[PDB]
Amino acid sequence: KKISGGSVVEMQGDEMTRIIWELIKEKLIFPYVELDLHSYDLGIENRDATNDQVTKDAAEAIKKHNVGVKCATITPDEKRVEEFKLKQMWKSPNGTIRNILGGTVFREAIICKNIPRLVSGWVKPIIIGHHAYGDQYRATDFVVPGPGKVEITYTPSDGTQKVTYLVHNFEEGGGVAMGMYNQDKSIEDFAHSSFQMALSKGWPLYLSTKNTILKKYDGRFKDIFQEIYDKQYKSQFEAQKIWYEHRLIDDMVAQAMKSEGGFIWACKNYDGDVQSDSVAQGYGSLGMMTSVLVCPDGKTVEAEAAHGTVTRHYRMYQKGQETSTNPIASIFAWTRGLAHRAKLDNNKELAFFANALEEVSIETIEAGFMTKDLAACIKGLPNVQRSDYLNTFEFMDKLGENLKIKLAQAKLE
Amino acid sequence: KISGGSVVEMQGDEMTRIIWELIKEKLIFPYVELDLHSYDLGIENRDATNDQVTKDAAEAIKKHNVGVKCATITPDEKRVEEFKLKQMWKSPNGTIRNILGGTVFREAIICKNIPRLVSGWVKPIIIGHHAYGDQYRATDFVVPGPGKVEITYTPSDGTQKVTYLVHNFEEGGGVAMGMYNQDKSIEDFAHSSFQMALSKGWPLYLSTKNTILKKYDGRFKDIFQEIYDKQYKSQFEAQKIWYEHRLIDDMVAQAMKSEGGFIWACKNYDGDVQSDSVAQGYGSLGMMTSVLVCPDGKTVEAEAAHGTVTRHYRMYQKGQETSTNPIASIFAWTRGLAHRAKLDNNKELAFFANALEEVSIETIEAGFMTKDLAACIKGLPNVQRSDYLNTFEFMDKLGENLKIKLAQAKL
Ligand SMILES: NC(=O)c1ccc[n+]([C@@H]2O[C@H](COP(=O)([O-])OP(=O)(O)OC[C@H]3O[C@@H](n4cnc5c(N)ncnc54)[C@H](OP(=O)(O)O)[C@@H]3O)[C@@H](O)[C@H]2O)c1
Numbered sequence: 001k002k003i004s005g006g007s008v009v010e011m012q013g014d015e016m017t018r019i020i021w022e023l024i025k026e027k028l029i030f031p032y033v034e035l036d037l038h039s040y041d042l043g044i045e046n047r048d049a050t051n052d053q054v055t056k057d058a059a060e061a062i063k064k065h066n067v068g069v070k071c072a073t074i075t076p077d078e079k080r081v082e083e084f085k086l087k088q089m090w091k092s093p094n095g096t097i098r099n100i101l102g103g104t105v106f107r108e109a110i111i112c113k114n115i116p117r118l119v120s121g122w123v124k125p126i127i128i129g130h131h132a133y134g135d136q137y138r139a140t141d142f143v144v145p146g147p148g149k150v151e152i153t154y155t156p157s158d159g160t161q162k163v164t165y166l167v168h169n170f171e172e173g174g175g176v177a178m179g180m181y182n183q184d185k186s187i188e189d190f191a192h193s194s195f196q197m198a199l200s201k202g203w204p205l206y207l208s209t210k211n212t213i214l215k216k217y218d219g220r221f222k223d224i225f226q227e228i229y230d231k232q233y234k235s236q237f238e239a240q241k242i243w244y245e246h247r248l249i250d251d252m253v254a255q256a257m258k259s260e261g262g263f264i265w266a267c268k269n270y271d272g273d274v275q276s277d278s279v280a281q282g283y284g285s286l287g288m289m290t291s292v293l294v295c296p297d298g299k300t301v302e303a304e305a306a307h308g309t310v311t312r313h314y315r316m317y318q319k320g321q322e323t324s325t326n327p328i329a330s331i332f333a334w335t336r337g338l339a340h341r342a343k344l345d346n347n348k349e350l351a352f353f354a355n356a357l358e359e360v361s362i363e364t365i366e367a368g369f370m371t372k373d374l375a376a377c378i379k380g381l382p383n384v385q386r387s388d389y390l391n392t393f394e395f396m397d398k399l400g401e402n403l404k405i406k407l408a409q410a411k412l413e
Numbered sequence: 414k415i416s417g418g419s420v421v422e423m424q425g426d427e428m429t430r431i432i433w434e435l436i437k438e439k440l441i442f443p444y445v446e447l448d449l450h451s452y453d454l455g456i457e458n459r460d461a462t463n464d465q466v467t468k469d470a471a472e473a474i475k476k477h478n479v480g481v482k483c484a485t486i487t488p489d490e491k492r493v494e495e496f497k498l499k500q501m502w503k504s505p506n507g508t509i510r511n512i513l514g515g516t517v518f519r520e521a522i523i524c525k526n527i528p529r530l531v532s533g534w535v536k537p538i539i540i541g542h543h544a545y546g547d548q549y550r551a552t553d554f555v556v557p558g559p560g561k562v563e564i565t566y567t568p569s570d571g572t573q574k575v576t577y578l579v580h581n582f583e584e585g586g587g588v589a590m591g592m593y594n595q596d597k598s599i600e601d602f603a604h605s606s607f608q609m610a611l612s613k614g615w616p617l618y619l620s621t622k623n624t625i626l627k628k629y630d631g632r633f634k635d636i637f638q639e640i641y642d643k644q645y646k647s648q649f650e651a652q653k654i655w656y657e658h659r660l661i662d663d664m665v666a667q668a669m670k671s672e673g674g675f676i677w678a679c680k681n682y683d684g685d686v687q688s689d690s691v692a693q694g695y696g697s698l699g700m701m702t703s704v705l706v707c708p709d710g711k712t713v714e715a716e717a718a719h720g721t722v723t724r725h726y727r728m729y730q731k732g733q734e735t736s737t738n739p740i741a742s743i744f745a746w747t748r749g750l751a752h753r754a755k756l757d758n759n760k761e762l763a764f765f766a767n768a769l770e771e772v773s774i775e776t777i778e779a780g781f782m783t784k785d786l787a788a789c790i791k792g793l794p795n796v797q798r799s800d801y802l803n804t805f806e807f808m809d810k811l812g813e814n815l816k817i818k819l820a821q822a823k824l
């Protein structure tokens with residue numbers, strides 16, 4: 001009696017995450033749930049094999065079936081082109097997908113009692129989202145060769161008066177300059193995703209900006225969030241004993257470091273990249289970072305780990321050496337995905353399993369069975385020895401055993 | 414008694430004014446004679462002068478080169494109606510940078526008994542930002558609807574103008590903005606960062622997002638490699654250190670797994686302590702120093718990265734016990750004097766500047782500190798009164814330890 005899972009769009013990936021991804025399906029997922037799976041290999045060979053079309057096709061499956069679970073993919077730089085002999089430097093799959101689906105990406109660390117956090121006292125979860133990976137990806141930048149006047153202009157499409165804003169008047173040398181933009185359409189999406197992520201998770205929501213300085217730019221993020229909230233989300237927030245409030249980023253950081261957690265943060269940063277966030281990097285185990293892509297309708301969810309393909313470990317695997325790669329984030333991609341499926345289907349057996357799997361993963365670590373990065377968090381890297389951790393299979397085997405027990409006992413009721 | 418020479422001083426506001434005068438009295442004036450050129454950068458003095466006193470303070474730093482600044486009230490719509498201000502005056506620190514050029518760094522004083530966010534960080538990590546980041550150089554506006562936003566360059570020459578597409582709003586509006594940076598700003602920023610790394614004896618690293626802003630940030634990066642290979646390259650090799658560029662993604666992840674011990678030039682939009690996670694995670698903003706350096710090498714103005722500690726000031730006003738950490742403020746003075754000692758080559762003053770930091774540190778390593786610092790070790794919930802000293806007790810204990818340290822030197 002396997003569980004009837006329903007329609008899920010799976011997306012296979014590259015390197016160490018592919019290798020693990022399979023272990024998850026075989027050892028933790030398929031022995032218990034029969035899915036109407038809709039796989040899409042997005043490993044770099046096949047993306048190149050199809051001219052990055054398989055990426056676009058997965059994005060459309062996700063729209064239709066409302067549930068995606070994606071493995072980590074190689075985004076090609078120059079050296080990967082030469083390494084796989086690619087036809088061209090294909091765009092990052094994650095951006096391709098999120099452009100098609102609209103909506104917003106939220107990351108969150110998985111927190112275990114026996115794993116130190118930067119801030120002890122952070123005990124309820126911190127869930128942060130950025131506006132389409134950041135304001136930097138919508139920047140038009142160039143060098144100013146010599147003296148002169150840089151300006152920005154609005155050209156009403158109808159054809160009423162132009163308006164010109166002097167940016168700077170370079171009077172005695174060169175420099176650099178750039179323009180940045182955001183569409184209302186897009187800010188509204190960010191709003192709806194954030195509010196609806198908050199209702200779904202049950203915590204309150206904070207929008208941070210720098211509207212002391214960017215009065216009109218960050219202003220209009222605030223006013224849009226406020227109009228949308230006051231017009232269509234307040235009653236449902238009140239009903240969950242939660243709220244939305246805008247903060248100055250200055251205020252918002254000071255609070256969040258003096259807090260216990262349990263909130264949604266809509267950061268209006270310039271850079272949304274995980275790899276440049278000091279706190280995310282500071283936990284000291286990127287393998288405990290989940291992500292989720294929520295769309296402005298509330299139905300459509302795509303889940304995935306926030307780390308990369310772990311190329312450094314992958315090269316060791318190929319040469320047949322020990323690896324201690326952390327599967328958690330990838331495991332939680334499946335459980336968040338499956339959980340949301342269950343939400344849409346009103347499928348209590350799936351919801352139980354999903355939660356169960358998340359539960360066991362933390363429990364397993366808390367008993368003191370874990371991968372090297374987590375032991376390193378406990379003891380310190382120079383102090384870690386081989387008998388403090390399990391390799392990638394030993395930890396996956398352990399999670400299988402503990403999952404068997406959990407569900408076997410849990411059945412008796 | 415040790416004559417220092419000329420220093421420039423700007424008296425501050427609220428809790429920092431009180432803490433200032435105590436440092437002057439107990440720590441500075443009994444050990445050292447000075448030619449204090451003092452400006453009253455309290456809010457109420459500025460309003461009386463129509464902000465002009467801030468200018469005078471700044472221009473005076475030009476002549477003498479050493480400044481020590483007490484935290485100051487930067488007005489706001491409630492601070493206006495609090496003092497009936499003639500106008501909502503601008504930030505003093507800004508006016509002072511604006512007038513001196515220069516690049517503001519920020520350090521956090523560390524002790525062996527005060528947990529850092531990362532245990533492994535056992536050396537200083539000094540961060541500078543390019544003129545407070547490019548949000549203060551931004552020009553924002555609302556887009557009412559469908560239409561084009563174009564950024565254009567009209568050469569002074571008169572040669573053909575250039576025009577890049579920012580975005581064409583097809584359906585509905587949004588927002589737009591453009592920011593700039595003159596090359597001279599960047600040369601200064603780089604110069605300041607090369608001088609700062611040379612004095613503090615640590616390697617340098619510049620962070621950018623040149624994988625997305627290939628031109629804008631790339632430009633920063635070259636001016637850094639150019640000026641390095643040109644003017645400073647072999648001076649580093651002489652002091653056994655090095656300069657390198659790091660993609661911001663790479664820099665952050667390298668830092669957080671390092672032992673500290675480097676200068677960091679952050680090319681950023683927001684160079685405000687308030688919004689820095691890592692600075693607000695230490696626990697005591699009372700431990701965060703900040704030092705303005707100029708390109709020319711000659712000019713240094715020190716202060717505290719924390720504000721005026723208003724919540725503590727209101728407790729001062731009512732006779733209620735306060736526990737305000739003065740280290741940053743002490744370090745404003747030691748930085749100012751250790752610099753003045755290198756200008757004057759005044760060895761006697763140099764020793765005093767290093768003496769007072771070692772004392773400040775030793776006191777806290779010994780286990781005598783303020784409430785913030787106690788909270789970092791135990792947790793604010795677990796903190797008993799017996800765990801820490803109040804504003805006054807901590808001073809007297811430093812004053813005491815300063816006296817004893819100075820004595821043993823003579824011998
Ligand atoms: N959406 C995505 O799928 C996504 C996101 C980011 C990057 N990537 C791609 O993945 C490839 C590799 O990128 P990268 O090496 O920069 O990033 P990465 O895969 O996150 O690896 C960086 C380092 O972090 C540690 N780490 C990350 N995940 C871990 C895990 N699950 N368990 C244990 N340790 C872990 C490892 O450090 P130690 O080796 O020191 O243990 C690893 O070398 C690139 O082609 C990149 O474009 C993909």
Ligand SMILES: NC(=O)c1ccc[n+]([C@@H]2O[C@H](COP(=O)([O-])OP(=O)(O)OC[C@H]3O[C@@H](n4cnc5c(N)ncnc54)[C@H](OP(=O)(O)O)[C@@H]3O)[C@@H](O)[C@H]2O)c1
Nearest residue numbers: 484485486487698699717719720721722723724737738785
């Ligand atoms: N250097 C400058 O010129 C500068 C920099 C920032 C702000 N300001 C100005 O000064 C005011 C800032 O006040 P603010 O309350 O916003 O920020 P703040 O005075 O720097 O600090 C606010 C809180 O931080 C803690 N704190 C700061 N310094 C401390 C110390 N030395 N010892 C112990 N705790 C300390 C206190 O927390 P607890 O209350 O929890 O103990 C305090 O309530 C504003 O009017 C602003 O315009 C000036």
Ligand SMILES: COc1cc(NCc2cc3cc(Cl)ccc3[nH]c2=O)ccc1C#N
Nearest residue numbers: 107108109117118122126256279280283690
């Ligand atoms: C509950 O523990 C965590 C939660 C996390 N959530 C994600 C996150 C939080 C976050 C919080 C702030 Cl104040 C600033 C930037 C941030 N960036 C992030 O990506 C990350 C790390 C830990 C730790 N330790």
Ligand SMILES: COc1cc(NCc2cc3cc(Cl)ccc3[nH]c2=O)ccc1C#N
Nearest residue numbers: 519520521529530534538540668691692695
């Ligand atoms: C030696 O430990 C410290 C040094 C500090 N230096 C100042 C500073 C560091 C810093 C480091 C990063 Cl990775 C990011 C932003 C940062 N902003 C800062 O203002 C601050 C805190 C601690 C701690 N714990």
